[PDB]
Amino acid sequence: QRTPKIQVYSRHPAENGKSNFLNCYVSGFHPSDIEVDLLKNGERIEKVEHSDLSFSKDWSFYLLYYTEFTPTEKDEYACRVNHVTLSQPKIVKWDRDM
């Protein structure tokens, strides 16, 4: 079993008050069954889409989850992932410089 790597990032350069997209890219995992949520101040964001399942040369899967969002000063955003390899959900906070 291979546990997922996680990146959480915006599609475009982030500016408080300006429209954007929030990404969570999960990769490197196996088996393919996975549970990914986007969080706004700790609460499930609801209208999230994801890409079609594919895999890399080592057979490990990757997905993109995304929705539109407009960041602000006060709002915090996060990706929450559960997988068979994890005994508890991994939360990764969005850092706008990563």
């Binding site: 790597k5 599609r11 393919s32 410089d97 990563m98």
Partner: protein, 274 residues
């Protein structure tokens, strides 16, 4: 530059009721352009790029037929391999397939491939010569004997050298607006202080395609890998890609370090300095 067409297939067995989950996707280079999902209502092959949509109903009839038949082979295999490996009927298992073709800058056949995997490990693979097989264990060797008796390799070779290359060529022409366009990385550098002694320089490459790209640091004109970090290439979500490379430096010595970007859409590599 070089191009490829590549299909990916995943089947996941569903213990307790019914047929496996089956997802197929197709790429030209780093652009997805087709998709089948067994859970989807349409039960058709569906378009995922605009240039694939000028194919007629006969294309989608044809690809739907084939991809469904693909799906049945995989279902059968999951049963077969479970036997091979003497595993219970109780667990979920996975088969994965990719095959496709590379061409060079002249659009001529360069190589093709057909790889097959069980529960995420090599099972059997067509060798570069397209005439012979790599089998990873004795189960896989039994499949090899089968496929050798049935002349599978010859059938795949014909497809991989012929129809794969032909249709890749068609796709490249039809989608020229985007598939033959290279998007050079938009680059910048950022600065972030950890203490009074130490700072991090981060080199950004944004909005580029294809995905292939090299970021490197130098100190005073010499390659440095120590005290650097390089993130996996990730998708922007609009068809382009992002990456960054960072290095830790003594505060005040920023000017010593340079970031070097290679990509198909820059005629000469770029150099960035804080």
């Amino acid at each position: 530059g070089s191009h490829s067409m590549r299909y990916f297939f995943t089947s996941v067995s569903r213990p307790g009721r019914g047929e496996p989950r089956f997802i197929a996707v197709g790429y030209v280079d780093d652009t997805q352009f087709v998709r089948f999902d067994s859970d989807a209502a349409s039960q058709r092959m569906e378009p995922r790029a605009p240039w694939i949509e000028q194919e007629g109903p006969e294309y989608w009839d044809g690809e739907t037929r084939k991809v469904k038949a693909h799906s049945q082979t995989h279902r059968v295999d999951l049963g077969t391999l479970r036997g091979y490996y003497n595993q219970s009927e109780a667990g979920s298992h996975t088969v994965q397939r990719m095959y496709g073709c590379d061409v060079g800058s002249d659009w001529r056949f360069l190589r093709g491939y057909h790889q097959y995997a069980y529960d995420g490990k090599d099972y059997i693979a067509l060798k570069e010569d397209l005439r012979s097989w790599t089998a990873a264990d004795m189960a896989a060797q039994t499949t090899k004997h089968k496929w050798e008796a049935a002349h599978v390799a010859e059938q795949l070779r014909a497809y991989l050298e012929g129809t794969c290359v032909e249709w890749l060529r068609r796709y490249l022409e039809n989608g020229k607006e985007t598939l033959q366009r290279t998007d050079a990385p938009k680059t910048h550098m950022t600065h972030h202080a950890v203490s009074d002694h130490e700072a991090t320089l981060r080199c950004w490459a944004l909005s580029f395609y294809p995905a292939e790209i090299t970021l490197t640091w130098q100190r005073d004109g010499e390659d440095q890998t120590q005290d650097t970090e390089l993130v996996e290439t990730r998708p922007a979500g609009d068809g382009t890609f992002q990456k960054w490379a960072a290095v830790v430096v003594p505060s005040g010595q920023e000017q010593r370090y340079t970031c070097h970007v290679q990509h198909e859409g820059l005629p000469k590599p770029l150099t960035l300095r804080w």
